[PDB]
Structures are given as structure tokens and as C-alpha cells.
Amino acid sequence: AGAKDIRSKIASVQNTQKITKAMEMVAASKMRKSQDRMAASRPYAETMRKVIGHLAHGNLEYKHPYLEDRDVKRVGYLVVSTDRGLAGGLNINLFKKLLAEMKTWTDKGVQADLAMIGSKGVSFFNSVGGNVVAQVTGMGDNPSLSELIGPVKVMLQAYDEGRLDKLYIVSNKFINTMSQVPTISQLLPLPASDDDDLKHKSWDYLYEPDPKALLDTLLRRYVESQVYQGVVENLASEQAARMVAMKAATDNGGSLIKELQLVYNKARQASITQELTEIVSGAA
Amino acid sequence: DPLVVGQEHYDTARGVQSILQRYQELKDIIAILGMDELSEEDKLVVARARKIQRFLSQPFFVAEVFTGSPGKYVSLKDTIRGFKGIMEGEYDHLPEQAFYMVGSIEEAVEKAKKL
Amino acid sequence: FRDEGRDVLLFVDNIYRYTLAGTEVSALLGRMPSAVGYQPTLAEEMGVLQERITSTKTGSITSVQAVYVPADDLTDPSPATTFAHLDATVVLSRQIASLGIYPAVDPLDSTSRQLDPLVVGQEHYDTARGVQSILQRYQELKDIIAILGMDELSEEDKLVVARARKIQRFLSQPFFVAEVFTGSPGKYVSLKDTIRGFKGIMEGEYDHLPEQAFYMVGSIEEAVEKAKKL
Amino acid sequence: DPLVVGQEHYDTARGVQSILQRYQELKDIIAILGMDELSEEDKLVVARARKIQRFLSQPFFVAEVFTGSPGKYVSLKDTIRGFKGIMEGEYDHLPEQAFYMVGSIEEAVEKAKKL
Amino acid sequence: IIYDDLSKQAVAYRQISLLLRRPPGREAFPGDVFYLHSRLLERAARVNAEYVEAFTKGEVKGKTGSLTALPIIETQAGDVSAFVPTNVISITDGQIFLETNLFNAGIRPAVNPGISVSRVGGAAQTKIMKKLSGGIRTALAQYRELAAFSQFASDLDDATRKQLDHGQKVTELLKQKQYAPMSVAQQSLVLFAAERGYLADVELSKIGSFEAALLAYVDRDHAPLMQEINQTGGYNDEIEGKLKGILDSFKATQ
Amino acid sequence: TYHLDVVSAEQQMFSGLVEKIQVTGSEGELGIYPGHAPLLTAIKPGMIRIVKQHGHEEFIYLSGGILEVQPGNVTVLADTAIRGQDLDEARAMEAKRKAEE
Numbered sequence A: 001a002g003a004k005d006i007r008s009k010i011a012s013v014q015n016t017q018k019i020t021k022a023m024e025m026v027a028a029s030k031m032r033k034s035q036d037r038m039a040a041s042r043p044y045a046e047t048m049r050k051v052i053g054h055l056a057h058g059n060l061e062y063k064h065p066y067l068e069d070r071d072v073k074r075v076g077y078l079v080v081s082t083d084r085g086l087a088g089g090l091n092i093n094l095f096k097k098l099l100a101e102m103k104t105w106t107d108k109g110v111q112a113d114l115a116m117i118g119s120k121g122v123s124f125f126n127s128v129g130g131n132v133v134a135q136v137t138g139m140g141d142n143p144s145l146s147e148l149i150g151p152v153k154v155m156l157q158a159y160d161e162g163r164l165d166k167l168y169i170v171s172n173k174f175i176n177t178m179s180q181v182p183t184i185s186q187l188l189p190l191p192a193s194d195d196d197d198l199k200h201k202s203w204d205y206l207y208e209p210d211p212k213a214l215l216d217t218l219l220r221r222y223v224e225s226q227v228y229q230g231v232v233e234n235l236a237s238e239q240a241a242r243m244v245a246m247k248a249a250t251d252n253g254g255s256l257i258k259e260l261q262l263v264y265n266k267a268r269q270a271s272i273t274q275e276l277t278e279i280v281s282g283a284a
Numbered sequence B, D: 001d002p003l004v005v006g007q008e009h010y011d012t013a014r015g016v017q018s019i020l021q022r023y024q025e026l027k028d029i030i031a032i033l034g035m036d037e038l039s040e041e042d043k044l045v046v047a048r049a050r051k052i053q054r055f056l057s058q059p060f061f062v063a064e065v066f067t068g069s070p071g072k073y074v075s076l077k078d079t080i081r082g083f084k085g086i087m088e089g090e091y092d093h094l095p096e097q098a099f100y101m102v103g104s105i106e107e108a109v110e111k112a113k114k115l
Numbered sequence C: 001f002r003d004e005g006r007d008v009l010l011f012v013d014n015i016y017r018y019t020l021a022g023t024e025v026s027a028l029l030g031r032m033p034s035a036v037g038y039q040p041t042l043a044e045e046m047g048v049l050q051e052r053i054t055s056t057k058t059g060s061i062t063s064v065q066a067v068y069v070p071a072d073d074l075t076d077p078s079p080a081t082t083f084a085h086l087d088a089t090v091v092l093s094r095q096i097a098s099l100g101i102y103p104a105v106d107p108l109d110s111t112s113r114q115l116d117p118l119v120v121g122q123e124h125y126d127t128a129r130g131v132q133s134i135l136q137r138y139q140e141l142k143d144i145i146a147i148l149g150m151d152e153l154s155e156e157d158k159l160v161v162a163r164a165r166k167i168q169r170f171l172s173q174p175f176f177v178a179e180v181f182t183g184s185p186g187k188y189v190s191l192k193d194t195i196r197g198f199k200g201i202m203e204g205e206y207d208h209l210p211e212q213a214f215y216m217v218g219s220i221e222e223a224v225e226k227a228k229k230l
Numbered sequence E: 001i002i003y004d005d006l007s008k009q010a011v012a013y014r015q016i017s018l019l020l021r022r023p024p025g026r027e028a029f030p031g032d033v034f035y036l037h038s039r040l041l042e043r044a045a046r047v048n049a050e051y052v053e054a055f056t057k058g059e060v061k062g063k064t065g066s067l068t069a070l071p072i073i074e075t076q077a078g079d080v081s082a083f084v085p086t087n088v089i090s091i092t093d094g095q096i097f098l099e100t101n102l103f104n105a106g107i108r109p110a111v112n113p114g115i116s117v118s119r120v121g122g123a124a125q126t127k128i129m130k131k132l133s134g135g136i137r138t139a140l141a142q143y144r145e146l147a148a149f150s151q152f153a154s155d156l157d158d159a160t161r162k163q164l165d166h167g168q169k170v171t172e173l174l175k176q177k178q179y180a181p182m183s184v185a186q187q188s189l190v191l192f193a194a195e196r197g198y199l200a201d202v203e204l205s206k207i208g209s210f211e212a213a214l215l216a217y218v219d220r221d222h223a224p225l226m227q228e229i230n231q232t233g234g235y236n237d238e239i240e241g242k243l244k245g246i247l248d249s250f251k252a253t254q
Numbered sequence F: 001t002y003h004l005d006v007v008s009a010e011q012q013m014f015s016g017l018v019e020k021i022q023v024t025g026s027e028g029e030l031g032i033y034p035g036h037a038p039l040l041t042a043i044k045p046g047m048i049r050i051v052k053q054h055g056h057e058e059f060i061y062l063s064g065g066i067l068e069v070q071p072g073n074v075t076v077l078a079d080t081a082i083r084g085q086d087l088d089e090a091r092a093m094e095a096k097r098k099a100e101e
Helices: A002-056 A091-105 A120-128 A145-160 A211-282 B009-031 B039-057 B076-088 B105-113 C014-029 C042-051 C077-083 C092-096 C123-150 C154-168 C176-182 C191-203 C219-229 D003-032 D040-055 D076-087 D104-113 E005-021 E035-039 E049-055 E082-093 E100-104 E127-146 E158-175 E185-195 E205-219 E221-234 E238-249 F088-100
Strands: A074-080 A111-117 A132-136 A166-174 A178-190 A206-208 C007-012 C060-065 F001-006 F013-022 F029-032 F037-042 F045-054 F055-060 F065-070 F072-080
Touching: A002 A206, A002 A211, A002 D003, A002 F001, A002 F013, A002 F072, A074 A091, A074 A120, A074 A145, A074 A211, A074 C014, A091 A120, A091 A166, A091 A178, A091 A211, A111 A120, A111 A145, A120 A132, A120 A166, A132 A145, A132 F088, A145 A211, A145 F088, A166 A211, A166 B039, A178 A211, A178 C191, A211 B009, B009 B039, B009 B076, B009 D003, B039 B076, B039 F045, B076 B105, B076 F072, C014 C077, C014 E035, C014 E127, C123 C154, C123 C191, C154 C191, C191 C219, C219 E205, D003 D040, D003 D076, D003 E100, D040 D076, D040 F037, D076 D104, E005 E082, E035 E082, E127 E158, E127 E185, E158 E185, E158 F065, E185 E205, E185 E238, E205 E221, E205 E238, F013 F055
Parallel strands: A074 A111, A074 A166, A111 A132, A206 F037, C007 C060, F001 F072
Antiparallel strands: A166 A178, F001 F013, F013 F029, F013 F045, F037 F065, F045 F055, F065 F072
């Protein structure tokens, strides 16, 4: 009913378009806040990396299970995912890259299992039927490391007891506002390239109680910081993807409105012409 | 009618009809939100519907003066077998363009090798 | 007036009301209506009026006609008939008047089919197209500036933003009849003067002047003088 | 208007009208974007409005042939009190179906227990 | 003069024309339906002193005369593109659009800004009201766009938050009970309160009670100022300072 | 004097030049002075108290972390909680059962 309902449909599409236009700006501001958090996160991680490098590559070289190379018999991943929809194809791209690597490791006969952050990954990998050992959901904005302590603790327990031989973090990277990339990077064993120094380990740190327990705690805190930083960066990438998707949705609504208006105008003219032909014919 | 055409032809025709109806139903959501919002079964439905739409095309002998490509004659057995295979998902690895303007499904797989 | 050899301006306050009056007269006469209910002689009644407004060897009559769109429908028979005779369109917007720019003429929607290299020459065509592209680019970059902030803007886009602001403020002009409003004497700008000024602004000369030196100034030779004391 | 119905009835009617009007707008966002995009207060408004919408239903004992259920008669005061209670937090915990074709508010809790 | 349901007059004239077998136009209205409403409404006008003097044969000299018309038109389904509505829109000097959606919402007066317009504008308005009303106009203009952000306004620039909570309070203030007209002094007082930021800390739920209490307070303690405002409608620093004192003194109470 | 940093994986807690601090070391209470030899130790939960330049007193509570000392630099890598109870192993069980159910 062009005279009755199409006029209502046009208004509904207009309202939806305005709502998406607002959502784009909301996402753009949340992206800036997430960028500030992400930039704040780095120096703690880089300082702890400097300390672990000094302890590992000092004149006296220690050996630790989290540090030494071990042959591969089981491979593990932990994956971050969004808890809200929209955000384009970010989650699906990340999941299919993870599935490609998981299939590559399966072909070598290596058993794999997953730790999960975010409900989208939980649902997708339950549909796939991959082994999920741990899950955490519902961070929303302002995610906390305190929640993260769990899954990393259980993945560490699996790794050091021999159940796991290598560990990867799967997340998207905020290259910039316009571009994001899904990436996978190793956590255990410590992949970082060696470094050399003289000042350190010459004017060596006094160790209390002993250098080894401090190294264990330091490595655990380092991997925890790595996964927290990955989570924050993935959140920022989610916000950027949502901004882009909302721009596209607003443009689509704006394109639909004009075609609906053209159809409505054609119907409007046709109705007037038909009814006036009827009126004139009725005056026999 | 199943009595005259037999059961297999009837079932293939109704399956194609239902798949295309579902695609028409999804297209309004696709127009605004894009395909990414769809469920994983809905995306498979869309992917199969597009392949079905492409496969319905056929080069005509009288149209050679327009397309240039030679015309094709397709038997009923070949079309029902090809459409049933497409709906069963045997050819989900092929691109959409493989089915465009091909006489039969074997020609579709041959076109796929050169994309 | 034309037969005396002068050039004449003819103001029609609403051509749409002329069309409606013709429709009413034809309905009173009892002729059969046409599509959307207009008179069957709509096109000829429009042509009779419009065809007398032309340029004769003795002189010319030029017309400025206010146009109304019955339902914002540009396909309605009255707008469809009217547009077939219009040579140029001038659009006034309250949005520009909010900036204090007068005359409040929209430079992006106003069009003229005389704007062609074979009619106005290559220099005028290039200047107008450049100005239009710069303003369109500015309208694009305003969305970026609002959504993400100025930091996102490259140093080349900042240049086009500043140039677009200076152009958008140069279009202002004081009218002799508006002296009671602005309190400033009106200015008359020849075509070559404005062409040269906009060509200069686009080509990067006068870039160093403050943006307020262009506002309501007149020609560019007055803009450089205003900058000297601004 | 207040001069006839008194201020209580007028206020209740205006509240119901405003709540239903707000819900009519929110439903458009819900239909495409989904309910998670709303503010939690807008979610609460949607819930309570969807409750009120069903509570307006009432079985008539001239329609038992159609429904197969006993008809209900309600006084004005009980209607006012029930709509006041639904507008406030008294019944946020009851499901939507708990109100459908119930009658007085005093028995919607019974259907919720039965649901 | 108020014409109730000019559309009903148009229907009656259409009936008369069709019973007399006159040729029908669009929507069966006769050809001269526009002339019918046009010649009626054009009578409403203001005449100069010389016309009055000539008509009364010089018995009244210094007075101008005026007739103000408020025609009423009923749109069937929010359609302003119908025939008679289009004609009356084209004839009149302004439009007051009443909206059913707003009427269903809490705003009883249901006047819709942004679509309603008066082409006479500020000339018709007293000096104080003309001074004050621009704030309301711009506040509602800004508030209209932010209404889209209202759903998720928790994450916004504080400037935008202030604009939103100001537009909302102004819209809440504009509602008014039937049969209760407010003198120019009271409208100017509440408009001054809204514009000068005195409502910034008042809750949206309590705006009406604040207005009623302020009106009672000014009616009790400061009647002469209201009398002067009703008599003159002037505005100056001596009046703005008095209003500031009124509002500061009231804000200590309630 | 030395430049004290107090930081966590989530946030920078404090940064500034400091004349002396009191901090609870792993084996006992410890005081740090400018020019202190390089030192590395975990810190038990409790207050770390600070005097900035001009001896202005500042108190910060920490759930824990690692304290270390460098020539002219003191950096506290505090963490959110003790984490020694490891109750979240229970949190990992429901993730498995809900995947099985």
C-alpha cells in the first residue's frame, strides 16, 4: 500500500540510518579510549622484557622450562574474541586463520586444544567441535587482568607438566585506525631473540631470596602481561571494525531511502491519475 | 506433479525453489547489514543460492551472434543430476563464475580448473 | 523595453502558481484532465510564456523565476516541464546563512549549463571546476574532522581545508542594497576579477593571508589591502 | 480528563500511553540491530511495555466457544492498581506469557507459577 | 477569528458543486476550490490609519485595524500533500503542526518545532520575548540531533551531554496544562529561568513543580514587576538584574 | 635523587623523583636511598611509602609485585592481586562442562 505503508517504511529506514550514524561516532570515541589504554600498557611489558633479557643472557646463563626449547608433541592456543556482534568479519577471519594453522598441525599428528576469551569464539569453536579447555566472557569495555589470570594459569599448568609443548596467542593487531590484521604469535617457549650487554650482570642485581624463584615469577608475570596487551589491542581493533561497519550501514540505508522514495512517488502519481480518470468517466 | 515427472525431478525442483526463496528472504538483511551478520548456515544458503542462480544460465545456439560462445543442449537427466549435486553440496569448493554460462556440470568443473 | 534595445530582467514570483492557475482555468472550462490532474495543454502553455523570453538582435530579456516543487517530487509534471526550459539553477540554503555568509548561495548544488569550455572559455571552466572539487573535498574531510579529529588530517589535507575555508569565505560580498545591514559600502565585481581571485587562491598565491581577510571584502585587490590592517 | 476520572486514572492512562509510545520506537531498533544495542533503561522499558501490552488482554465469557477458557470481569479500581503495579517494579520478574489472557493482575502470578 | 475545520467547508462546497453538475477537478473538488479559500483568508489583514479614516468618514483617525484568522485544517494520515491542505498551506502566513506521536508522548501541547514556522517572525513579538526566544530556538535545534545519541549518551563529550540535558529540560518545560494561559510576564520569567542556566541542576522529573512554585512565589512577593512586564514587555539591564534577583531569591526555597 | 616508577600491566601508578622510600621486601622491610646498589626482590602486599623531592610524604598500597633498583632508577612492577590461591582452576571447570553439556 504505497499510500499507506511505504511512507512508514521510509521513516523507519530514516530512523535506523540516524541511529547507525550515531553509533559510528560512539565507536570512534571508544576507539580513541582503547588506543590510550593500549599505549599505556606497553612500557611495563617492555621493562619486564628488559629484565628477563638481562637475567637470561647474562654472563651466567640460567635454564628454565618456560625458556628452553622443547620438542613438539601437543600444540596449544588461546584466542580472544568479541562479546558483541557487528564489527564486520573480524572474528570469522581470525577463526579461519586459526583453523588453517590448527589443520596444519593436525596433519602432522599433533593434538591441539584451545583457551577461549569472548563468547563468539566459544560459540564458533563449539560448532567446530574443537577442544576448549578454558573460557572467560563478559569483560566488555575496561577488561581486567584479574579475570585473565585464570586461563593463563591453567595453560601454564598444562605447558610445564608436559601436556603442552608450545603456546600461541591469537589476536588482531591495531596497526592504525584504518587497518587491522589477524595475527598469531608464540608465548611459550620464550621466542624473543637474544641480546647482549655489559653494564647489566657486571654491576649485577643482588638477588633476594635467590635468582631462580624471581625468574619464575618474572616469566609468569611477563606472559600474563603479553596476553593482557593482546586483549586490549583486540578490543581496539573491534571498535575500529564497528566504526567502519556502521559507516557502511549508514550509506546502505541512505541508498535504500531514495529508491523507496522514487517508488512511492510513482505510486502517488499513478493513484491520482487513476482516481481522476474514474471521476471523469463517472460523469457520463 | 510427482505422478507425471516422478519423485526425483519434483524434489529437486522444490528444493531449488525453497533455496531461492530463502535467499530472497535474506537479501533484505544483506542489503543493510551486509553478509557478515548472517549465521553460518545462512551464509551457506546464500553461497548455494548464488551457484544455483549462475547454473540456470545457458548458452543458446541462436544467441551465438550475441555471446559468441557456442550453444549447448542439456538433457533433463543432466540438469536434474547437476542441480541435485549442487544442493547436496558436492561442488561447494567451486567459485560462482564456474557455473556461469555452462551447459552441464562437467563443463562447470572444467571451467573451474581455469577459473 | 527590449524593443528599445535594452537588456531586461523579468522576475516571475512563482511559475508554479502560473501552472496552477492554468489548471484551474482548464478545469473550469471542463476540458479533460491529464496525468496527475494537470491540464492537457500544460506543455504548450509553458512554452508560450517561456519562448518569448529570448535574445533578439535588438535586445534580450533575461528571467529569474522562483520554482516550487509540489511534494519535493522532481518527477512531477510541473517541475518536469519547468526544468526543460531552465538554463541555470540557483539554490539558497539557510545552512550557509547560519555562517553569516551572504549571499547564501549553495556553490555545490547551483548549476548552469553555460558552464562549458565552449561557452565561458577554458579558464573560467577550470576555475569553477577547481573550486567545486575543493569544496566537495572539504565537505568530505569535515566528516573525518568531526568523527576522528584534526590529528588524522595529513599536511596536504590541512592545506586543502584552509584553502576551502578561504574560498568559502571569499564568496561573501556586500550588496549596495544591504548597506543598512552590514554598514559597509556595496561592491561590484567583474567576471575577470573574481576569476583571477579564485585562480590565485587555488594556485597558492595569497595563501599567507588570514582567512578573515577574504570575508565580505570584494575583489582580491581589496583582500590584500584588508589584510594589511586586519 | 482529570475533572471527570480523577487524577489517579488520568495519570495511569497517560503513563501507559507514554510507555507504549516509547516501546513502539524502540522496537524498530530491536528489529534490525538487536536488543543488546539498547540502554539498560531502554531494555527495562521494552520489557515492562511488552508486559503491559499482554496485560491489556482479557477473556470474555461470550467467546468461550473460541478460546475454550472461562471469561473474566474486572472492576475499574483493580485495573488501575494492576496497571500501576506493572508500570512500577512490582512485577518485573514475571514472564511476558504470564500476563496473556489472564484477567486481573492478582492471577497473573498464578499463571507465571503455572507457566 | 477562528475557522474550525475549513476542510469541512471544502467538503460542503464540493457537494454543492457536484449537485449542480459542475466539472470536477482533482479529488472531485471543483476547479475554483483554491479561489474559495484564498478570497476568504485574504480578508484577514491589517489596514493603515488612512483606510480607517476614509471608511469611518473621519470619525476615527489615529487607529489602525486588524483581523487575525486562525484556520483549522485536519490532515487525515499526516499527509500534507493532499489538495485542500496544500492550498491552505500555500495561502497562509505560517503553520502550527500538531503531531499525534508527540500527543501520545508526554508533551500535551504536541506542537512540533522544526516543521512549524511563522513567516512574520520576530516582528510580531514583544521585545523581551524576542530577546529570550532565540535561546529556546537554538536549544531545541541542537537537541533534535542529539536525540539519536540519547540511547547511548553515557559515552559522550561533556559539552554534548550538557546540550542534551538542556534540550530535554526545555522540552519538558514547554508542556502546559489545558485551559491555563500564562501571561507574558510568566512566560518570560520561566523562559529566563530556562535560558540563563538556572535549571542546570534541577531534575527532569521535577521541572513542572519548579515552574509552579516559581510562579506562586513571584505572584506572592514580586507582583509589581509582573505588572510592569505585562504592561510594557520591555527589556533592559534594570529588568534583567531584577529577574536575576528574583531567581536567586527563589532558589533558596523549594 | 633517583627517579621512582610505580607501574602495573594496566596503568602507570606513579612516576617522579624520590629522595627515599620504605618498602616491604620479600624477606623483610627495606629502605632505599640514592645510589643504592642494584637489587631485585619481590614485595609482599602492604604499604609502600614515599617522600618526593622536598620530603613530601606519599603512601601507596600494593597487593604485591616485584621491586628492583638501578643506578638512579627505582621501578615497582606491582600486580593486581596475590594470585597465590589459584581459585580460577575451578573457573576453568565450568568452561569444560558447559562445552560437554
